[model samples]
Target chain A: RPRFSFSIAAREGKARTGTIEMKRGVIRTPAFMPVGTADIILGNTYHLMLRPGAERIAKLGGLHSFMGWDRPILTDSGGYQVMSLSQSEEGVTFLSPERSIEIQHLLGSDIVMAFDECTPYPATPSRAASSMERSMRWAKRSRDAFDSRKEQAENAALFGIQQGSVFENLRQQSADALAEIGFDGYAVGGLAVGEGQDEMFRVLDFSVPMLPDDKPHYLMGVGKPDDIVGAVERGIDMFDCVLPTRSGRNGQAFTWDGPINIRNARFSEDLKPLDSECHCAVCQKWSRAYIHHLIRAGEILGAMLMTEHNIAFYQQLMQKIRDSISEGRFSQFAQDFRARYF
Target chain B: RPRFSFSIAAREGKARTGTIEMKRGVIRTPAFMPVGTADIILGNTYHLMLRPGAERIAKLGGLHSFMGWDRPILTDSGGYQVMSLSQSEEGVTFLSPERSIEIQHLLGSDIVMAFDECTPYPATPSRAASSMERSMRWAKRSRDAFDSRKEQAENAALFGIQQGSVFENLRQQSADALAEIGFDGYAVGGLAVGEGQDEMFRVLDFSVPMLPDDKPHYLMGVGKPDDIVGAVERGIDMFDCVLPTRSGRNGQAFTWDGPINIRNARFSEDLKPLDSECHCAVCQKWSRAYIHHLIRAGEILGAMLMTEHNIAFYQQLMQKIRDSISEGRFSQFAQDFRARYF
Candidate 1:
């Protein structure tokens, strides 16, 4: 089978921008994918599969056809949910969150992750190591399951995750094991969970370089715009986060000058867009005043607009990063983004 | 101001079907408008209003645009909720039970219902009479509030509700009071609240013919598929119900052979569509098995698909009723539909 092939177009400092070509579609890196846990990220497989069957989405075209998003869709293996649910007795009994791999497989995702537990922050080194081992076992099971799907086996690429919380040795061990078992791509997982920015950076400082340079490197469940830029600088090529959508729902908007909450009384009558430099549809059409009214009114349109704007903002940030890398100015771009975004 | 104009095209037994032309849009008679209480029906308004803002709906589009519906939209004045709350409170408030008409006025609904208390079932004749009088008074206040809006005064139509519970004399009294005060259309209210179908029919039997024939006659918060057909046969021109949407969420589908709950274990592996005779997007694309899995899995898409299907079913029913009326076979059509749908 043809694995994912990465063609790095340019590099500046440790940051690079490139294209990862897989059988299903080509992913432009550094790409920021929106997480659709339970398929509720604005538009995703859940809505498409239910309203218009996956077959219809495939017939009407695909996830791209049903959602009007033509770009490559990379869905997580839902390992985070499994890890989250391992807390409660009922959740432990009833919720086999790893079943999400089967669900994603059925939905015909272009790129899928092998389900892996995102080791919680503050976990002991031993606990993190144990979790990484479990994740590796699950990854093998996920690969076996994917191989059984004739169509998916041929077109979709699977990425294995390295999970070790903040422990450098465990992370390297996880990465080495993932490389041995083999995957089309490798993701640096289990960071960004309440770990301070500096601590996360410390882990990435050594962990990312350990993974194969030819393969695309993914940073899972991260982060603010600056965090993405920082991770890219640490040699990460792909990223996913609910920060944009989740923050949007909470009235926090990411902008060129950083984040602003629309619920503040200051925005009650502000005529300015969420960001003056932003060209998102929400920013273009709606004023902060209207968004504020919607948020106060507890309107869903507020969430929709905010999510749309945030997604667009993240995507645009990725585009700018890619452009800067191409122009051999990645370090300058990262510095400038942190200066303004922070 | 253009009043809501209605023309009866055909009558089957006591069931009549026609069309209502308001400035906002044309509503085919016997329509079932889905409710968008508190301004969010499963987070679809974001999708709706982005394309059709309330003002844009008022100017270029209509209620249809405001709700992502291209069909006729009959928005509640939120009077039912107000009444329900009042009943819960044991008649503590003198006026309507909820927010002022100002909210509905701002919502800019095309077919706005006058604020009225839905007289509680099993009410004494005196209690029903008093409530009917209070409702008439509130109806006048509602009309005055509606008239004060420059936009509504120019084009938006108000439908006064006759609420007498199951009392024929009280119904006539409420109807007469609304007629004297003046409204563009009339609605037979205060039925469908566990009164049973027989009692509901008896109330409609006497109440409907008392309203102005030139105006549309609405039956609010009504009902099962058969109840809609029955109400239409009793001279009601329009209807709104939460059955299809509510039941859909609960896995119940309105089918030609009556409602079926898809979550039933019998449908665990049934690959048939929810409704054999239905052509809704959900029915056309999704198998019962898929929907069954979604419902059991507690996925939001289950609710989305079911709601969409229910809304489509309602619209299709209205179309069939309209076509029957236009073809001068409404009575036979009603009988046929009742025979199968019930």
Candidate 2:
């Protein structure tokens, strides 16, 4: 039996819905993972190795059992943040591509991300090319280090990230280099950093098609309800972002009618659920009025309830996306969702 | 049909196992309520009125529905905190006895406590007498106001508070006044207010016998595991405290042996459950090592998981208390628990 495998179940236009099966669990595509929810979650190699340390996590029985999440985890290599300030090799500490793969291995990550520089927004064409080339070099090193760990290589799948800021030719070159190196999956990266939705979509329009369609495609740090819908339409399979969980903790909630801030006085006496269409545990029982009061009082329960609702909302969105694609109604579904959400 | 009632199921000496049946839910006796958990919780009249406002909660479908807790709520009458620092009637703002009862009624409280002064410890005999007498007077006013609201009176049960600052004669006088006025239950108030456990137990030794034996006896703002065990042994039937939840949020977890601070570095790689004996969701799935990392990292989930375990531990302690009494082995249970916990 394969340690990792992906299969498309159905499609409409460029949108496809499928499942990625691993020994730990199955992740349904158009899967929208909460920062820490649903069937899969993205763990940070940087912070985990910094505070608790990846070695500690391994000793305590890996990230899955330690965090009590017995599901597939996509551990993101710390390259993006580690390369954020444009510090050269001599300027920064050693969190090399090889070390990143080692950390992910220690974390017992099911889906390991290749270490690569996430080219920042507003870069010149030449600078974008340079960043993309360095990322390709690092990706090969990440792959080589990953292959060296024979046991982990057999058990976990590796994904190469495509990064070239907004330069289409650079994106194509990055994709070509990563495909030739060969990976279990491909990711369209470095788009959501500071680029507006329109520019990000413009990049995805060409960037996604350049990557291998036979493998699963992940869009890193891309989001908002509308963003996910458009990315799925552009053939992206997996997504991870902090908006839902972070915003929810800060008193923001998403609905079919866009997001609402529960801290507002308008909801102080409103005897309605956060979202009428949401059947999550929070919305099923609590009212806007009570949540409003809880937020005002700085209650931890308020954050827990709000975060739970947001996670449920994101998962429900994925479920709807899957069903829409399966029934060959994705285009119309996308149209209706964009019109309602925006 | 009775709106509220209490029945003793079994007893061993002064320790009794019983149930407080209300319209919303049943509360098992020697019940140790969380700051908010198990079947019943104590909602603070002061905080609820200040932030959410009692009227807003009532309009939004009462406290039970507002907070999504469909169980018995014992709304404390805010007398202790309101009257802290020995402020006279003229010095403080109007939170009259009548108003306190009205707020609880509006919040749809299952057990409404009568407004009374919680006389502070280290008081002169004269000061204690004065505070106790004023509390009795206020108790009468609270009773009168509750009776006047005939519709609410039939739906909710009111309990008069006995306040005497550890003076035996004063406790007798206060209890006598409250009994004459007639309430559904009686509370031994003002004992845990800076008085040592030995002093509080000394007060309970005399105070518990003075209150009506047929009615449920409540010990307000009570305690640690050992304190609850002692209180139950002295005939106290109900308790509410912030120790478990508050301490848990700050990284404290209670086990059968004692409370362990999860933030300690010794547990950084310890792969044991928070409590080996605990059957709560947190303990059954998560490890102390991970919980330590979460707490050290200041993660919200740390507070959430820790709080849950503490609440479960307290509830389990109450369950043990009830079981021991019912099985005629409460003395053995209490002795063994004290030896282990301390």
Candidate 3:
């Protein structure tokens, strides 16, 4: 049977360089999957099911072909978003753990996430425990349902989510529970949801070490360039974020130093590429003045060119991170990056 | 000095296959310039002059480099749009014939159009005569100003617009006046403005023969698949319109058979390509079902993909028309196209 496999090629301090081999393609460690679309994109199970319908997608040859992408895709279980429901357990009624797995299978997802209640911020210790415990129960159900589908789970990987709202004790308990239940990988979840980077880093300090080091570690809904670099330093191997693409459409560009808004009047006559150091086709061919004019004129080409450059910037960042780790200079590289980026 | 040149390769009745050689690129006859952007696109002098300003573009290296398009660009003198100013002769006060020529020069236009009042439909013969006479006067001023700018006019070509509403005598008079003044080309301007296709065709039958047969004949703002086919049969060599790109953004796709609204419910499970016959990357890789979902869901990629396919379809249609004319079968080709398309 086709299988999901991962292996680390190098390690520097807490950072690691690895590869995740799946049915469709191999994803590099410390990878930044552009939220909406990329080499490895994060697809929303809720949105896909609502619009095209998962069953219809399967009939049309699955998500990869439907989206015209022949690369790895990780689909969330719709559990985090389901928090919009007033009742915690009742929300699961609409999208049950089994149903989430079924939808992921129908969508032909490479990495399927377990349905877990994302613990809200600023909750009391007792409340955090309750949410984390409930999430552990859902994770077990998600794993059992996935295994029951034997043949359907062959080419796919199921990931159990660790949810403990900033409490190290609850985090350890959640991690231990997932390890005992067993999953293809584990995600550090429920942080980066308004906890801020410092608090998020604090949680990762104690939480990430508890997951199995041999398996790939994913950080759900994580962040800007600095956020990704920090998480990689804290041992995160996978990440997905909307900043690059969403900001790009808004006329913001990601550069080696920092982000810049292309619509600024100062850029109207600036005859320079979006980023001189970048090698993307957009950057190679178009100038800041052209992009500024297009964005100001509300032309669609502006969004297209900016988005392409942003996505390329992220991929280049990931490659640099992997290279730094392999060459035993990740610490120096991260420090330098943060110094300039911040 | 570099000069604009045109040559005919083959002719089948009124339809002809030819080429227009300019400094930047070579344009084949019967070419469809995708309204907003293409190998050869129609740039709005008014919108551009207002936003980026023509001098600003000139400082940054002209419209071609500014838009990242390295091809021939045809820019109107903002005259037809200036008709919105609620005055005829007074409107020229805002963008004078001399000023219009100066702006086109600053834009570095390959094919610059002379400022002409687009005569409103259903006008009396006297009013049509007055409007056409005024346009002829502006054509002389436009030519004199262009000739005065010796170096700037070297690599550029200027075309005069014929305006006469639906009056054949006025059209013939306008054509004679422009031919007497001499220009790189001549354009039929006032017909497509609500005159209906049949009426426009009637004007073309008489008006086209009045102009120099050796020079290229352009049907300004003339459109739709059938409109182009009929105009080509009436001796038009160039065309530009917004139907394909604009309609594509609105989820409408043009095919050899007919246009289809991709957002319709009928396409939800239709897994076939947008057009099986289309050789565009979008049509080759994506399904109608996916495009339907994207359009319904309001994804930007939907507009991007649909626009790409629509532009490709128009180019392919032009190529087919050219080939048909060159191979001595344009009449049969146009008839077959209309029968299927309509």
Candidate 4:
């Protein structure tokens, strides 16, 4: 893409280690961005608009200074809320394509997500085609709206989203529509809606390879450490999931050896760190005992620390995956990781 | 006062500047200690006991390390909660004196408050006298509790609280009782619980002069910027209040001019900093509009930043008070402060 550049540093099969250079900052891949919960946490768009509003954030000097975060931010389209929050499209929170683009632009976000309908899991093939077609149309409209803000394009990169609801033909159709419309990047949307890991993987297997090789592939809400490694092998480069921060706030921690719930009495006096292999600040400075007490006590610091640890764990995971790809050892790394983690 | 010491560096009228030297760290006077919400920000005693319990915190390397704060920490007795939570004694979370001291000792607090029943305001002289008598008796028990923890006493300072509601004779009697029982410092408790500022000020006017000049005088939970300044002028040396932090979380900011609600529509596009004269990190980097957006948007950083500014504001105010007191311009300073602030 002319506005955004993804440079692959190394490759091992479909998995690659690289950097996505945007005007604001550099994002290393495979990257697991920690949602800004006000602390490297997520500040969702709908929640943000209702409260701070874009003009206020802009007045305050953009998202980075407003939240004291200097890293790249990927703005989520309201589409996720629509499909994820409700049982059907009628329950959707519509922003209209132009307004969605406008809000992203106003936010001064580095990576702007294009608006598209997220098809629910278990959609009929005909229903999937209609959703995909509408999404492509919205994607076109999203691109047009983004282009209207000519100044924003110079610094912000917009990603076109492809929605197929698990059907291969519709996915290809969506992908073909996106490539023709053109974008800085592409997102493989509508998979992780409780569709089971293998079914989602099967969709990614066919759908991920169909997009332009040069453009980065973002698998929306696709989750867990295992899923990440698998998706990377299927050619995905980026991810944003509430799994890490969300699980963290609930005292759930992700470890190389699978997830560990800190609240269990077993961890009450456990002197060991959360993850022996991990060296996050929380891990280095605190013990399972302390985090357990914090969470059990319902301390926000427990959530803060837990979220920090999980984010660090995921980021560290992303770094390791990148290292393995660079070393041409993805298969070995994946095998070793899954064996211990699963 | 052998384990700890307070030495007056300067005096202007009743206002004086001093230093509280403890094993933990040096506290400047007239200091305004920020209340930790368990977040450094203590979530409080009952909450702390349940979650990151004392043992867990100690294992994590003491409260300072647990919360990433190396500065002096003064813990509350939960005495305020007993009276403030209910109309009378039956609902009291009575710790039987020893338990209260043991809890503070376990949490590794630098300034351990002596447990006493905080008397309710507007009480009949007879009710006030009975409450005062019990608190002093509890104060005697509190001293014994401190003595029992001989090793902890070596590292921590104990402050006996004075309570008599608005009755001067009872207040001085309570103060005399605390002095006779002996303590590292003295706290004028039970004043700010719904008592009007004028009534609170009247009690302080009479009660403060009765405290030993050699020991530090703490105005517990007594607050507001003007109240802090006024109390400092009335020979109060140390204080802690939730006002700055609490008001901050609610989108209110403290400024020399006045407090402003950052969430107001007027601040939506108002690009000025919260306090133009303040140089705290929040003021240095964020605007009223930006903070307005964050708080309105329900971001924790908004509260974090707001608390930071408020803390800085109070700390700065203390320094200025100390400077004026040291310069022997206390009357002039108080006059100027009240004129502008009121």
User: Which DockQ values do the candidates obtain, in the order shown?
Assistant: 0.05, 0.64, 0.68, 0.27
lDDT of 1 by residue, A21-137 (tens): 765456788988775421112234334444444455454344443333444577666546545643331122322234545666656677878867777788997888887888777
Model 4 spans with C-alpha error above 4 angstroms: A36-72, A83-103, A141-149, A152-155, A263-274, A291-299, B38-71, B86-94
Task: Report the candidate with higher DockQ, 1 versus 3.
Answer: 3
TM-score of chain A of 4: 0.94
lDDT of 2 by residue, B1-342 (tens): 378889999988888889888887888998887765277888878887876688877877888877778778888888677766225652237377888889999988888998887777888889999989988889888999899998678888999999888789999999999999999989999888888899999999999999998889999989988999999999999998999889987889999989999999999988889999999999898889888988887677789899999988999999999999999999999999989888
Flag clash pairs in model 3.
none
lDDT of 2 by residue, A15-83 (tens): 899988888888899898766537789887778888678888888788888877888889898867666
Q: In model 1, what lDDT does residue A14 have?
A: 74
After the best TM-score superposition of candidate 3, give how far the Cα of residue B238 lies from its true spot, in angstroms: 0.4
Per-prediction TM-score to the true structure, in the order listed: 0.74, 0.96, 0.97, 0.87
Candidate 3 lDDT over B48-159, as tens digits, reads: 7887898898888888888777788899889777775424563465487888999999988889998788888889999989988988998999999999998667888999
DockQ for the candidate 2 complex? 0.64
User: Candidate 1 lDDT, tens digit per residue, B70-151?
Assistant: 4334456554564464332222242242333454444555666677777778899999998888888888888888888887
lDDT of each: 0.71, 0.87, 0.87, 0.80
**CAPRI-style docking class of model 4 based on DockQ:** acceptable
